[PDB]
Each structure stands twice: as C-alpha cells, then as structure tokens.
Design a protein around this nucleic acid. Structure first.
Ligand SMILES: [K+]
Ligand SMILES: [K+]
Ligand SMILES: [K+]
Ligand SMILES: [K+]
Ligand SMILES: [K+]
Ligand SMILES: [K+]
Ligand SMILES: [K+]
Ligand SMILES: [K+]
Ligand SMILES: [K+]
Ligand SMILES: [K+]
Ligand SMILES: [K+]
Ligand SMILES: [K+]
Ligand SMILES: [K+]
Ligand SMILES: [K+]
Ligand SMILES: [K+]
Ligand SMILES: [K+]
Ligand SMILES: [K+]
Ligand SMILES: [K+]
Ligand SMILES: [K+]
Ligand SMILES: [K+]
Ligand SMILES: [K+]
Ligand SMILES: [K+]
Ligand SMILES: [K+]
Ligand SMILES: [K+]
Ligand SMILES: [K+]
Ligand SMILES: [K+]
Ligand SMILES: [K+]
Ligand SMILES: [K+]
Ligand SMILES: [K+]
Ligand SMILES: [K+]
Ligand SMILES: [K+]
Ligand SMILES: [K+]
Ligand SMILES: [K+]
Ligand SMILES: [K+]
Ligand SMILES: [K+]
Ligand SMILES: [K+]
Ligand SMILES: [K+]
Ligand SMILES: [K+]
Ligand SMILES: [K+]
Ligand SMILES: [K+]
Ligand SMILES: [K+]
Ligand SMILES: [K+]
Ligand SMILES: [K+]
Ligand SMILES: [K+]
Ligand SMILES: [K+]
Ligand SMILES: [K+]
Ligand SMILES: [K+]
Ligand SMILES: [K+]
Ligand SMILES: [K+]
Ligand SMILES: [K+]
Ligand SMILES: [K+]
Ligand SMILES: [K+]
Ligand SMILES: [K+]
Ligand SMILES: [K+]
Ligand SMILES: [K+]
Ligand SMILES: [Mg+2]
Ligand SMILES: [Mg+2]
Ligand SMILES: [Mg+2]
Ligand SMILES: [Mg+2]
Ligand SMILES: [Mg+2]
Ligand SMILES: [Mg+2]
Lengths: 258, 189, 163
RNA sequence: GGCUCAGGACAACGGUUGCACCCCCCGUGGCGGUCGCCGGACACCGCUGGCAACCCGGCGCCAAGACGUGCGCGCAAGGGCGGGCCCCGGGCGAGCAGCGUGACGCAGCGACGGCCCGCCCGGGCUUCCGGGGCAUCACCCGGUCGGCGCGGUCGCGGCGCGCCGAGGGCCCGACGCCUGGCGGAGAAUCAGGGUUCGACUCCGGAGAGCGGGCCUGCGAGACGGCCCGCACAUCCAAGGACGGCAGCAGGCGCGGAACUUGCCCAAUGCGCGGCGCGCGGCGGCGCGACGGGGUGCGCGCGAGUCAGGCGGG
C-alpha cells in the first residue's frame, strides 16, 4: 500500500467475531482508540447482530446519533467503536447494564450487573515509565494512564478505577496464588489460580494455572489478567470459566433439542 | 483589431475602451500622446504579458500555484505555459492602461458595498477601539447577500473568554497541589 | 534521486543482482551542507515533519573547558586538522570532529586562578586555544565543543609540529 | 477501494526474531506555567477586453474556525561535566531512561487553546530455516571482503566519499546462461509412498505505453497529479493546444478459444455526513461445469395460457 488500511474483507475478519461467510464482501473495520483490532468486537456488531435493536447499519447509526449508548460511563457515537474486555455496557431506555467478559471459546459475552457494580473498572498494568520533567505514569490494557502512581503498584498487576473521577481506589498484586482469567490463546476465557510463574532470560515467561476442578493449563504472562484475591472482584458467567470437553458438549447439544 | 485600450481611473472609477509606447515596459509612464501607465495586456491568441521576462516575444515557463495565468487543480500542482507578450511592441492585439495625473474625467461609480469589521466601521466614521462599548449596531448600509459586522466584542464573548482564561489557572492549581501530594508520599516512604 | 537502497549493491559472492521495483521515496538521499566557516541556517522538511537545521557560514560556538569547568562563547578562527582529508582542512569546512583554533579573549579571566593546566594557561596567554567540534553542523545547525587536554592534546600538537 | 501478472530466481514469498538503530494521520487516555480585541488582501461578483479554441488579462468595491503579528508564569533540538578502577528500583537479561549544573539558542503553542506524551493500526529495515532448470556453464568477485573517519538518512549499514588492509564465495554445485518464472494459503489424480499445476476468490509483492525527475502532504518517487526524452495517435483559420481503458461497458487486431455501449446506491462497507460510491448489488448474454425432476401409470398429472397474491429500489 501507500498508506494506512481503511477496508476489511469479511473472510479476513477475526474468527471469533462469528461473522458469516455470505451476507457481504465487506466487514466493519474497528477504529483506533481504547482497544486494538484483534482483541475487540465493535459496537455495531454487538447491537445489530446480537440484540436486534437495529436490523441494519442505517438505523444503528441513529441510535448512536441521539446518544443512546453509554460505554465506560461516557456516551459514544461511532459505529466502529472498539469495546473490549471489562468495558461497561449500559443502555438506559431498556434498563440494561453489562460488563464484557470472555466465554470459554474465546468470544465476547455481556454479563448483567447492578448499579452497585457499574462503579468501577478493572485494568491491567501494562507498564511504568517517565514523561515530562521526570514524572511517573502507568499505562494499562484499556489505554488509560495514571500519573503519580503509588509505588507499590508494579507492572502486570491490576487496578480498580472509578469511571467518573478517573482515580485508583484498590489494587491487586500478581503473585503465586491469585484468581486469574486468560484473555488470549486457546485457553481464552478460562479462570484458575496462579501456581507457577516460570521465567526465562531474554524470552517470554510462562505461567501455569489450574481451575477449581483440577484441570491445569499454560500460557504466556501477556495473557493472565488478575480479577481478585482468592475471590473475584467482578461477576462471571454461570459457566465460571470451566470448559467441557467435546463429548460433554455434544450431549448438551443433544439435550437442548431433546 | 488594432489595440483595445482598457482605461481605468482608479479614483473616479471607470472602465472605458479605446482603440512612443513601443519598447515600454510594465510600470512605464507614457504621456497620452496619440491615444498614463501600462499595467498589463494581451498579445494575439490571447497570451498574456508577464512581469520580468524582459523580452518582446514568447517564453514557456513553469508556473507554481499562486502566480498569474494559473488556475491549479490540486495543492502543489505545477504546469508549463506560453506566457508571451512583448515590451509593448507590434504583435500586441489589446492592452491595459491606467490614467495618472488627470471626453475626460467627469463620472463616478460608487463604492458598491460597505465595510463589515468592528474596528473598520469605527476607524471609518472616526471612532476609537479602546473604550468599553464596541457594540455599534447602527444599520445604515443604505439598505442595499450583503451587514452582520465582525470582531464586535460582547458580554457573551467576554464571559466565555473569561471562562477559558480562569480554567487555564485552575488546572495548574490542582496540578501543583498533586506535586506536593506525591512529594509527601515519597518522604513518608 | 540520490538513493541509499542496497538493491544496487552486489551480493557477498560478487554476483550482479536483479531489479524488481522503481526507486522508493523513503530511501532518498540529499546533498550535504558543506558548512563554510565564517550566517545562514536553512530549514529542511524531513519525513513526517521534523525540521532539520542545515548550516552554512557559522562563526561562533559555545566551548567548554572540562577539568576547570568553565564555559564561554567564542569565534572559530581557523580549522587546522581533520582525520579524513587535507581538503576539508584547506577549505575551512566545519564537520564534526575537526580541530580548530578559537579566540582567547573569553577565557582570559581563567588566567588568574593557578594550579590549573599550564598547557592551557600559556596558550591563553597567546591569542587562541585548540579545541574539537563535537556537533553535527549539517543536521542541527550548530558548532559547539570542548577544549582539548590529556594525551589527545599532545597527539594533535605533534600532528601540528613544524615538520 | 478496482485492474493486471510485464519485470524480478540467495529476490519476492512462507513461517520465526529484533529495533538498547527507527517513522506515523485519525481515534482513545493524559498533559497544558513559556526569556488588552490588531493589520492588509484574495477568490465569487460589477465594468471594460484578447483569442479559431484551449485559456486568461486590467481596474474595484467586500468576511473568517484563512493568513501575518503576536498579549503569556522561561524551556524545542543539539553540546560539556557529573559510574562502579576481583566480576556479577522509574525500568531491564543487559549502564538503559530521567535529573542536576556550567554554556548556547529562541523553535513550537497563543486574535474561538495547543504545543507535547503513552496506546493503536500501518510502514521501514532486520535474525534464523525453507526458497526453479542446464556442467556442451568450473572457477568466480574487485565497493568486491574487512578496518578507521566524516557525510547523508526517519534510521542502521560500503548507503556514499577519503584513507588502510587482502579479503569474500565454491563439486553440501559458486559464478554464468535459460524460463511460453508472480510466491503462499491451495487445486487435479488416487490403497499406501507419490506425480503435476500453482493466470483469477484471501493474504503478500510489483506496474499503470517504455527510461527517468518531482511537487503537495502524517503518509506517494501517485500516473482517473505535474515535468522532460522516445515510440504512437488527436482538433486547428497553420499561429497553437493536447492523450494514456493492465477501472466498467463497448470497438478494432490477434488467436482454436471468452457476454450488455443495462438499472440502483435499497443491502454490504468506505468516505464525508444523507449524500456520494461501474465498491458492492439487481436484472441481460451464457450446454465451461454442478444439483434435482419428465417424456407415463392404468387413468391422473407438468409443460404452456389467462387472473390475484408473495417478493422486489
Ligand atoms: K497491490
Ligand atoms: K508510506
Ligand atoms: K496513511
Ligand atoms: K471476503
Ligand atoms: K465474503
Ligand atoms: K471504520
Ligand atoms: K446508505
Ligand atoms: K500536486
Ligand atoms: K530515490
Ligand atoms: K513505481
Ligand atoms: K515512499
Ligand atoms: K478484466
Ligand atoms: K508476473
Ligand atoms: K512472462
Ligand atoms: K492516514
Ligand atoms: K480516515
Ligand atoms: K531479515
Ligand atoms: K536473515
Ligand atoms: K531473513
Ligand atoms: K534462507
Ligand atoms: K547443471
Ligand atoms: K575504492
Ligand atoms: K562507513
Ligand atoms: K571508498
Ligand atoms: K580498497
Ligand atoms: K547449479
Ligand atoms: K508469461
Ligand atoms: K516416486
Ligand atoms: K497416494
Ligand atoms: K501420500
Ligand atoms: K503411480
Ligand atoms: K500408485
Ligand atoms: K477465471
Ligand atoms: K489478482
Ligand atoms: K492472487
Ligand atoms: K484478495
Ligand atoms: K491483497
Ligand atoms: K497487497
Ligand atoms: K495485490
Ligand atoms: K507496487
Ligand atoms: K513498468
Ligand atoms: K506509462
Ligand atoms: K513505465
Ligand atoms: K516513471
Ligand atoms: K524519482
Ligand atoms: K518516476
Ligand atoms: K494484461
Ligand atoms: K493487457
Ligand atoms: K456492465
Ligand atoms: K480471428
Ligand atoms: K476467427
Ligand atoms: K448503500
Ligand atoms: K456494476
Ligand atoms: K393437470
Ligand atoms: K398450470
Ligand atoms: Mg472478498
Ligand atoms: Mg504459486
Ligand atoms: Mg496535492
Ligand atoms: Mg488512481
Ligand atoms: Mg474510455
Ligand atoms: Mg482465431
């Protein structure tokens, strides 16, 4: 090319967006902002393709024009807005407040919550650095930044944020023994406890967890978000991050029609 | 044709036609001998005279956006053109001329429109711009789109400005507070 | 235009290599400043913005005596040595690393405080000091530096010997 | 976004690294300290013109979320000093990033407050392994292989230039020549092992008749942008102007061989914002090819015709 990319073929869209191979030659391409292009699902593909609030682009647009969609306590008007993990999804006209989590096949689910629950946001401490005139900053997985951070907050930990005032109230420490959920890989959406953090000079460090029924798994440290301290700080779907195997799933697919 | 001569008194206001200037160059003063100053012209085929070519014929040149003879289509377009002419020699079918040092001058063509700037109108009718009353919503205009003057300061504009101005001090108040906050954190740590 | 693409070089075995595209803009080269001594600083617009200052005809610079820790401004008088070629010396062309004579007037108040490097003091008693350029004149439009001392001073004085 | 496969065989491309050698619009989140309302002038438009047509001249009255200058609490780039003289938190595997202090400089942001910084997508280059045929092509290379120094670059680097050395590749096939050579994801065949093809749907590369050069911009060596050489064509009062269907339809020529000079932006997406879009869609031509059902059964049907729905811009 001679510049940036604007378009996006339907087949080249991420596999977990669950698009269908017919019904167009084009796909919505996410816009830059609070999340990336691979680990996200756009606002339009949530409203129009999931909940049928709009049956088309031409009337999803106007829902976003009269400002009916609150994301992270602030409205949005861009159909291609990338919403991601832990973002808050509240539409007031239908009285629905959600948070985004992953299912146990690596897809984006909207969990119901309460007004006592939508007051905070969990972020992953991506990095600590120095800006103008020598000041510290923490930059996170949702592209938030916090200056003058309490020195106890170190890289790869988790923070709890107020959506209105934009300031830190609680923090959780990534150590051996923390309840944590994966965000990528082929164990995306599964929850366990940190029970090994194995480090390697020059190269990636690997992390080994186990669910609450004994099944164990591995991943890179880039994919281990911390949710609590032997108890989650936010809600999780009634499957709680335990994956069935293929035959158990097949019998459930048999039951739902039986 | 022989030589159309656009004449234009830049004072009275008048664009009149007409039908010891050979060798003359732009900005020369001929003396209304048998037909004053040359500010332009167009040889045959229409090709316009260009300033500085110091010739009595034609010369293709490369023109950038912002020069005469050049209506560009994109920002940064250049094009080569035959800007020709002469030092007011023979092959000059048509020409432009201006009367200086005045049948003859008797007509006037009014100022078609009126000023529209807050400062402008006041300096015009001998008025300052430093005493707190810049409204000046008098509407004469000889009722003749074309008013709605500009740069006229008001209460709304004044207040809004003040708002931003103050804000650009509150920012620093709380910022330099937080500096002390973090200093104390470290010092107790 | 000028290019620094490698595709026009041979391989590491000497074989002619083929040509599979036309010159790309992002591999452009420009001509160099060739900063004359003794005041223009052009502006160059680089990739993405990025003002680059490109000098011609510099006369002054900021010079630092480190061991005594004194800095003053001064008029470059002459370029006397250069590691690449005698041509850049003969033309008084300001490039990084060349060795020049600077005016002594600014540093003459340091002639009071003793216990200092006599090889600097006796040279201040004259009318110039030997220094090296530390900046890149064609990239940042400036020629600043430090005064020589140590084995390096003696090395360049011997290079300058009346041989 | 669309088209095509001409060039290019240690390329490109595929997986796999790195930038403590880099650049980046929009959007998101930050941050915002900078040694009294100004100025004139441009286009649209009025009056007069030249020209075969292409395209322009002269004079004049008029605005800004246009310039220009700038009201402001000092801080842009670069430069000198500030490290440990068995070896091993701001941040690392790694002395990396900040700050302080001596000198220069006066940049950017300020006339409707934004210079600047993280993230993001994209780019550039970069480590390793894979990466056509011919021996009636056996030796090949000389900025070629390494070193020092400056320059140029967004940046590293023989990338370029000066100086020094004599290296570097090779029967585990160098170098040279040939290709009716785009690479991969893939496709055809069929017990197993294999053979052959990779025009075209996705990804990556490269081009816009062929050499070249460049302006504007965050981003192009752009051709539905400009400038010149060559080969071809076009109108013209003979003075001059002017083109690039390997975009969609359609024509010529070639060849054994390939359809309409349609309607619509209603969906899908993108741009800007309710529109625009030969993307993309909907009809037409269409025995390349695929899938399904008849030309009867022992006595009822489909193939056609005419009406109404349904669908469809
Ligand atoms: K391409
Ligand atoms: K580019
Ligand atoms: K771009
Ligand atoms: K597709
Ligand atoms: K598709
Ligand atoms: K978009
Ligand atoms: K539309
Ligand atoms: K242009
Ligand atoms: K070039
Ligand atoms: K090209
Ligand atoms: K380029
Ligand atoms: K075609
Ligand atoms: K090809
Ligand atoms: K070919
Ligand atoms: K862009
Ligand atoms: K855009
Ligand atoms: K490489
Ligand atoms: K390599
Ligand atoms: K490589
Ligand atoms: K290889
Ligand atoms: K062979
Ligand atoms: K040489
Ligand atoms: K070099
Ligand atoms: K050389
Ligand atoms: K040599
Ligand atoms: K061979
Ligand atoms: K071919
Ligand atoms: K075989
Ligand atoms: K087989
Ligand atoms: K096989
Ligand atoms: K066989
Ligand atoms: K067989
Ligand atoms: K085909
Ligand atoms: K293709
Ligand atoms: K292809
Ligand atoms: K494709
Ligand atoms: K592609
Ligand atoms: K491509
Ligand atoms: K392509
Ligand atoms: K290309
Ligand atoms: K070509
Ligand atoms: K061409
Ligand atoms: K070409
Ligand atoms: K070209
Ligand atoms: K070029
Ligand atoms: K070119
Ligand atoms: K072709
Ligand atoms: K063709
Ligand atoms: K068509
Ligand atoms: K034929
Ligand atoms: K035929
Ligand atoms: K549409
Ligand atoms: K079409
Ligand atoms: K029947
Ligand atoms: K019937
Ligand atoms: Mg497609
Ligand atoms: Mg292929
Ligand atoms: Mg332009
Ligand atoms: Mg184009
Ligand atoms: Mg055509
Ligand atoms: Mg034939």
């Amino acid at each position: 090319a001679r510049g940036v990319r604007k378009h996006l073929k339907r087949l080249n869209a991420p596999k977990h967006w669950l698009l269908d191979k017919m019904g167009g030659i084009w796909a919505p391409r996410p816009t830059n902002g609070p999340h990336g292009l691979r680990e996200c699902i756009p606002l339009i593909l949530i409203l129009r393709n999931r909940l049928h609030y709009a049956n088309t682009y031409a009337e999803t647009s106007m829902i976003l024009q009269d400002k009916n969609v609150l994301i992270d306590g602030k409205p949005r008007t861009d159909p291609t807005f990338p919403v991601g993990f832990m973002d808050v999804f509240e539409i007031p006209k239908v009285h629905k407040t959600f948070r985004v989590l992953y299912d146990v096949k690596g897809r984006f689910t909207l969990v119901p919550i309460q007004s006592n629950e939508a007051g905070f946001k969990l972020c992953r401490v991506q990095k600590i650095f120095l800006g103008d005139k020598g000041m510290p900053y923490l930059s996170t997985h949702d592209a938030r930044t916090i200056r003058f951070p309490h020195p106890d907050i170190k890289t790869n930990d988790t923070i709890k944020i107020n959506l209105k005032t934009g300031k830190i109230d609680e923090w959780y420490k990534f150590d051996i023994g923390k309840i944590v959920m994966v965000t990528g890989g082929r164990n995306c959406g599964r929850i366990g406890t940190i029970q090994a953090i194995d480090k390697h000079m020059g190269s990636y460090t690997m992390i080994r967890m186990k669910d609450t029924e004994g099944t164990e798994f591995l991943t890179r440290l880039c994919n281990v978000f911390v949710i609590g301290n032997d108890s989650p700080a936010v809600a999780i779907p009634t499957t709680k991050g335990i994956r069935p195997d293929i035959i158990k799933n097949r019998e459930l697919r048999l039951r739902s029609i039986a | 044709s022989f030589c159309k001569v656009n004449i234009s008194n830049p004072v009275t206001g008048a664009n009149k036609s007409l039908m010891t200037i050979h060798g003359l160059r732009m900005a020369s003063e001929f003396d209304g001998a048998a037909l004053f100053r040359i500010t332009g012209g167009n040889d045959a085929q229409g090709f316009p005279m260009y300033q500085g070519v110091l010739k009595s014929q034609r010369a293709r040149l490369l023109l950038r956006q912002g020069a005469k003879c050049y209506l560009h289509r994109r920002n940064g377009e250049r094009k080569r053109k035959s800007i020709r002419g002469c030092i007011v020699g023979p092959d000059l079918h048509a020409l432009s001329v201006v009367l200086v040092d005045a049948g003859l001058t008797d007509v006037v063509v009014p100022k078609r429109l009126v000023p529209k700037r807050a400062s402008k109108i006041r300096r015009l009718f001998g008025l300052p711009t430093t005493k707190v009353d810049p409204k000046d919503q008098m509407l004469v205009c000889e009722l003749i789109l074309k008013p709605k003057v500009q740069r006229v300061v008001t209460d709304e504009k004044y207040a809004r400005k003040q708002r931003v101005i103050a804000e650009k001090k509150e920012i620093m108040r709380k910022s330099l507070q937080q500096l002390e906050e973090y200093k104390a954190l470290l010092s107790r740590m | 235009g000028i290019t620094h693409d490698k595709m026009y070089k041979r391989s590491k075995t000497g074989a002619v290599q083929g040509k599979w595209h036309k010159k790309r803009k992002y591999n452009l080269g420009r001509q160099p400043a060739n900063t004359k001594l003794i005041q223009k600083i052009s502006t160059i617009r680089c990739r993405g913005g990025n003002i680059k200052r490109r000098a011609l005809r510099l006369s002054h610079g900021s010079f630092a005596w480190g061991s005594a820790d004194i800095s003053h401004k001064a008029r470059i008088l002459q370029v006397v040595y250069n590691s690449t070629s005698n041509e850049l010396v003969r033309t008084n062309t300001l490039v990084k690393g060349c060795v020049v004579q600077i005016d002594s007037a600014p540093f003459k108040s340091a002639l009071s405080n003793d216990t200092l490097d006599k090889e600097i003091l006796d040279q201040i008693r004259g009318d110039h000091i030997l220094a090296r350029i530390s900046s890149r004149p064609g990239q940042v439009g400036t020629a600043d530096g430090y005064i020589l001392e140590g084995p390096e001073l003696l090395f360049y004085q011997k290079k300058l010997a009346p041989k």
